[PDB]
Amino acid sequence: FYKREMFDPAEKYKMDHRRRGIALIFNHERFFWHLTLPERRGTCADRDNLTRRFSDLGFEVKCFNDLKAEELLLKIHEVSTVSHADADCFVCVFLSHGEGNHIYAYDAKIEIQTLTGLFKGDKCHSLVGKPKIFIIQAARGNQHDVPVIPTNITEVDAASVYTLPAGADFLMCYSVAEGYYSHRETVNGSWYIQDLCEMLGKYGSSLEFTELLTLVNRKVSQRRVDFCKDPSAIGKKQVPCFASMLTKKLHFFPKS
Amino acid sequence: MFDPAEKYKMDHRRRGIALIFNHERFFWHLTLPERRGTCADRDNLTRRFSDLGFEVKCFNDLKAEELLLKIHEVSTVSHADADCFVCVFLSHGEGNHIYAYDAKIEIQTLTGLFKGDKCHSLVGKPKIFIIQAARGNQTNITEVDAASVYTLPAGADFLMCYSVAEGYYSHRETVNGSWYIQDLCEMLGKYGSSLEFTELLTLVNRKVSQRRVDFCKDPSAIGKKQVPCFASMLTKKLHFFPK
């Protein structure tokens, strides 16, 4: 027996490289005053949660806190230009505010297509044909703070970031879709990241990853705020989504 | 309790309605080119979705007012006895709009008719939109159109399926039909009644993105790759097992 080159409806990405790969986490808790954006209490919990879960799946996790845009671009360009020949895949997470096709760094916004474009085709040959997974927790910062230099509560932010696709073998994962609202607990973290991390821990090492993101869709879209705390948040449902350009099934079975 | 393998309940009396809006030519004032090959797509889709148990209704070259009337009529009948709902658009598009014969319609208007508060009997059921629409260029020939329609999400339990993503190109053969629709239909025919539907759409991503654009008959088209995508808001696994 051998596998002839016939179309296989069950084909999986090859995940038997020496290393799982790098997972970058860009964590943004506060912003330059000229941006008029509120701080994001709870994001440090998200960052730590994600680090534990992706480390357990075999990723080399690198976190960066509150980088300026020039610094962020430098760092992500450095990762896009090294060889990933010995890696299975690549993960990039943004924890911030966003608007349209932009995510905010500390001092300025950056276009999502600029960040994903660094990993397309022969800009990053050693990731061609490998999953490139971007996870974005970014929505509209509520701006009732001034344009001047300056307990567990749930903050509710309108969806603002477009659910953009990218190239072949990219998977773009969004905390919330247009017309819905993103939620973050100031001590426990974001609804989306909490539920993503819980599902990674329970099922990440077995379930196909888009099947796992569908579980996250279900968990998040079924959450509600306590009515006695913030009646304002009634009817502000959160529905995540993911935009898949993947071409094979993706698993994170423990590496041998 | 939470079941990591939970499936949509697909044991209703009927599979449900599949609507297909098929646009081959446009009012002259829109200055959009004809879409030869689209009738093949329509026929292919009708067969595949019929075989999966759907009640397929096709509409050719409706005006926007006619199209809105029809999709509104469908959104207000009871789907209580149905598993799910499918809507296919075969046209040109731009941004958040798809073209009818005489005018643009916003995708969010069309999907909004099937949100929970407007269509109670589809609550918690899959609502699947499949969009073959890109930028009209203003024997079997292959036409190549730049991506133009945003890969928009919708509400819970919607699945939005696009023939092409930003930066890539959609292809249509004047005899054989659209690349995306051909490969979607081949996969439906072979695996539609067994495979989880997003796993099937992933196969379609692979098939379409592997179609070679190295040596076209039209030198203009060289290197203009096609990559589809789908945006899922589903909350459970979706299968179309024979009823």
Report CA-CA distances (Å) from A25 to A28, A168, B63.
10, 22, 49
**Burial class of residue A65, CB neighbours in 10 A (0-12, 13-18, 19+):** middle
Number of domains in chain A: 1
The span from the CA of A43 to the CA of A30, in Å, is 10
Residue A104 token pair? 């905010």
Question: Tokens 């608007």 — which residue?
Answer: A99
The CATH number covering residue B46 comes to: 3.40.50.1460
User: Range of A2's domain?
Assistant: 1-256
Method: X-ray
**Going by DSSP bridges, is the β-strand pair A22-27/B177-178 parallel, antiparallel, or unpaired?**
unpaired
**Going by DSSP bridges, is the β-strand pair B104-106/B142-146 parallel, antiparallel, or unpaired?**
unpaired
**Which of residues 195 through 214 in chain A touch B, CB cutoff 8 A?**
199, 202-203, 207-208, 210-211, 213-214
**CA A147 distance to own-chain centroid:** 29
Q: What are phi and psi of B222, to 5 degrees?
A: -60, 130
Residue B95 token pair? 């941004």
Secondary structure element (H or E) that encloses residue B189, with its range = helix B179-191
Q: Rounded to a whole number, what is the distance in Å from the CA of A47 to chain B's nearest CA?
A: 24
**A159 CB neighbour count, 10 Å cutoff:** 24
The span from the CA of B39 to the CA of B229, in Å, is 23
Residue of A nearest to B147 (CA): A165
Report CA-CA distances (Å) from B182 to A99, A192, A201, B99, B220.
36, 36, 39, 22, 23
Q: Is B156 helix (H, G, I), strand (E, B) or coil?
A: coil
Residue A241 token pair? 């989504």
Closest CA to A139 of A234, A25, A37: A37
The span from the CA of A183 to the CA of A248, in Å, is 32
Q: What are phi and psi of A46, to 5 degrees?
A: -60, -50
Residues sharing a CB contact under 8 Å with residue B182, sequence separation 6 or more, in sequence order = B41, B44, B173, B176
Among A7, A179, A247, beta carbon nearest to B202:
A247
What residues of chain A lie within 8 A of the CB of B6, using their CB? 218
The span from the CA of B37 to the CA of B174, in Å, is 4
**3-class SS string, chain A:** CCCCCCCCCCCECCCCCCECCEEEEEECCCCCHHHCCCCCCCHHHHHHHHHHHHHHCCCEEEEEECCCHHHHHHHHHHHHHCCCCCECCEEEEEEEEEEECEEECCCCEEEHHHHHHCCCHHHHHHHCCCCEEEEEEEECCCCCCCCCCCCCCEEEEECCECCCCCCCCEEEEECCCCCCEEEEECCCEEHHHHHHHHHHHHHCCCCCHHHHHHHHHHHHHCCCCCCCCCHHHCCCCCCCEEEECCCCECCCCCCC
Q: Is B187 helix (H, G, I), strand (E, B) or coil?
A: helix
How far from each other are the two terminal CA atoms of chain A, in whole angstroms? 23
**Going by DSSP bridges, is the β-strand pair B17-22/A189-190 parallel, antiparallel, or unpaired?**
unpaired
Which amino acid makes up residue B31?
T
The span from the CA of A155 to the CA of A229, in Å, is 11
Most B-contacting residue of A160, A205, A245 (CB-CB within 10 A), to test interface: A245
| Contact (CB<8Å) B229/A215 | no
**A18 CB neighbour count, 10 Å cutoff:** 9
Q: Rounded to a whole number, what is the distance in Å from the CA of B210 to chain A's nearest CA?
A: 10
The span from the CA of B137 to the CA of B144, in Å, is 8
| Chain B interface includes A218 (CB < 8 A) | yes
The span from the CA of B24 to the CA of B162, in Å, is 18
Residues sharing a CB contact under 8 Å with residue A189, sequence separation 6 or more, in sequence order = A42, A43, A45, A46, A49
| Contact (CB<8Å) B191/A9 | yes
Report CA-CA distances (Å) from B35 to A148, A227, B1, B195, B216.
56, 53, 50, 31, 19
**CA B94 distance to own-chain centroid:** 15
| Contact (CB<8Å) A9/B153 | no
What residues of chain B lie within 8 A of the CB of A160, using their CB? none
Q: What angle do CA A47, A52, A53 make, to 5 degrees?
A: 100
Q: What angle do CA A101, A105, A106 make, to 5 degrees?
A: 145
Q: Rounded to a whole number, what is the distance in Å from the CA of B216 to chain A's nearest CA?
A: 21
Overall resolution, Å: 1.7
Among B4, B153, B168, beta carbon nearest to A241:
B153
DSSP state of B175: T
| Contact (CB<8Å) A247/B205 | yes
Contact between residue A109 and residue A125 where contact means Cβ atoms under 8 Å apart: no
| Chain A interface includes B223 (CB < 8 A) | no
Q: If you write DSSP's letter for every residue of B55-87 in order, what string do you get? A: EEEEEES--HHHHHHHHHHHHHS--TTBS-EEE
Contact between residue A164 and residue A243 where contact means Cβ atoms under 8 Å apart: yes
Most A-contacting residue of B96, B204, B235 (CB-CB within 10 A), to test interface: B235
| Contact (CB<8Å) A244/B198 | yes
**Going by DSSP bridges, is the β-strand pair A181-185/A154-158 parallel, antiparallel, or unpaired?**
antiparallel
Among B167, B190, B233, beta carbon nearest to A177:
B233
Among B2, B165, B190, beta carbon nearest to A165:
B165
The span from the CA of A165 to the CA of B152, in Å, is 9
Residues sharing a CB contact under 8 Å with residue A7, sequence separation 6 or more, in sequence order = B203, B207
Q: What are phi and psi of A60, to 5 degrees?
A: -85, 105
Contact between residue A247 and residue A132 where contact means Cβ atoms under 8 Å apart: no
| Contact (CB<8Å) B4/A203 | yes
Q: Rounded to a whole number, what is the distance in Å from the CA of A165 to chain B's nearest CA?
A: 6
| Contact (CB<8Å) A243/B229 | yes
